[PDB]
Design a protein around this ligand. Structure first.
Ligand SMILES: Nc1nc2c(ncn2[C@@H]2O[C@H](COP(=O)(O)OP(=O)(O)O)[C@@H](O)[C@H]2O)c(=O)[nH]1
Ligand SMILES: [Mg+2]
Lengths: 177, 192
């Protein structure tokens, strides 16, 4: 059984790390932005062997002309933001949801809050407080998921591995529905 | 007084650049090299929209108080709205072939002859801009934005194929375009 997952969301919000930890089981140490790449994850869910194609994309607005090449025949969208970036959450309804709803009508969206480990990181909190902001709270992520009509909301950290397997299990269930 | 979406010669009296474009390049030269992930980390879209509206109105703007990521994004948006792109879509096939030329001097010579075919205003802006990116790349051990990283993050705002082409064509060469822009960032002092 073959299904296609596309991941989108702001530049540097943790998309590639999420995909790599899920598949290769190892956190990448390079700081390198993605243009496009494809991976495969074999996942068994509810007795079914799924070959899940993972399409990785660039979050930079510069790539807005190219990103739609990824969208055809998509079965599930992971729409990501970073917990350490309230701006990346605000960009969910302002930019990502309009694009995904346009090119992926009626495809289930999992809203994913990345870098959960930074929510209480002292450096992060002080950097955000300087700018009158704070890390995204769980209720805020959930509220946004409800607002955009997501299939679910999940938080994860690619760095600690927390929540990662659960993101892709949920995504696979959504893809099979 | 509209700023975006117009060729550079037509917004530049005697090829003098618009002040808000110069101001943006100045703050990015000043603050950019100290900012982790500059050009890569996405800015607040609503903030960008608001700044762009202000600039396109010719209304009064205090760029020292704007987020540096907002400045970076709005600059790239300005570039992305130059009809034909700042490198000229008409020259796209030549730009994508530059990195096939032999050694570094031959590459430089090919690029210089292509820059010669661009409007003067374009080249003045490109001088400013590749200088800023060179400065940023010089501090990559701090800010993580190597020449390659910067090239990936800015290339599609600098060059794209003629309007008649498919997005597949752009996708075919987008890696080559980033490798060209990486070369220009690294060598910009031998080039301009
Ligand atoms: N603390 C922390 N940092 C992360 C996490 N995931 C990614 N990062 C960092 O965020 C930056 C960008 O990640 P990347 O996956 O390449 O972002 P992308 O542009 O969305 O693909 C890198 O410096 C990663 O090390 C995480 O779960 N926790
Ligand atoms: Mg990536």
């Amino acid at each position: 059984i073959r299904k296609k997952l596309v991941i989108v969301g702001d530049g540097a919000c943790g998309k590639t790390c999420l995909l790599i930890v899920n598949s290769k089981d190892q956190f990448p140490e390079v700081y390198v932005p993605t243009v496009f790449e494809n991976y495969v994850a074999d996942i068994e869910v509810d007795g079914k062997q799924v070959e899940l194609a993972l399409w990785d994309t660039a979050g930079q607005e510069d790539y807005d002309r190219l990103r739609p090449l990824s969208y055809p025949d998509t079965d599930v969208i992971l729409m990501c933001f970073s917990i350490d970036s309230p701006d990346s959450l605000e960009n969910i309804p302002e930019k990502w949801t309009p694009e995904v709803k346009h090119f992926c009508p009626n495809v289930p969206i999992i809203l994913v809050g990345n870098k959960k480990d930074l929510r209480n990181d002292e450096h992060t909190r002080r950097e955000l407080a300087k700018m009158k902001q704070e890390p995204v709270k769980p209720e805020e992520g959930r509220d946004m998921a409800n607002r955009i009509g997501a299939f679910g909301y999940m938080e994860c950290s690619a760095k600690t591995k927390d929540g990662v397997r659960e993101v892709f299990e949920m995504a696979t269930r959504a893809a099979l529905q | 007084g509209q700023l975006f979406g117009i060729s550079l010669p037509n917004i530049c009296e005697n090829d003098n650049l618009p002040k808000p474009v110069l101001d943006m390049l100045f703050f990015l030269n000043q603050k950019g090299p100290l900012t982790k992930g500059i050009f890569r980390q996405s800015a607040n879209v609503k903030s960008c929209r608001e700044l762009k509206e202000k600039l396109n109105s010719g209304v009064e703007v205090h760029l020292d108080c704007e987020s540096i990521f907002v400045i970076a994004s709005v600059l790239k948006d300005f570039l992305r709205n130059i009809p034909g792109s700042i490198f000229s879509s008409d020259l796209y096939d030549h730009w994508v072939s530059v990195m096939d030329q032999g050694n570094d001097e031959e590459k430089i010579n090919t690029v210089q002859r292509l820059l010669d075919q661009l409007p003067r205003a374009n080249v003045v802006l490109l001088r400013y801009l590749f200088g800023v990116l060179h400065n940023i790349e010089q501090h990559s051990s701090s800010n993580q934005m190597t020449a390659f990283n910067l090239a990936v993050c800015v290339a599609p705002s600098i060059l794209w194929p003629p309007a008649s082409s498919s997005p597949e064509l752009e996708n075919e060469f987008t890696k080559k375009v980033s490798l060209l822009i990486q070369f220009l960032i690294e060598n910009c002092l031998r080039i301009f």
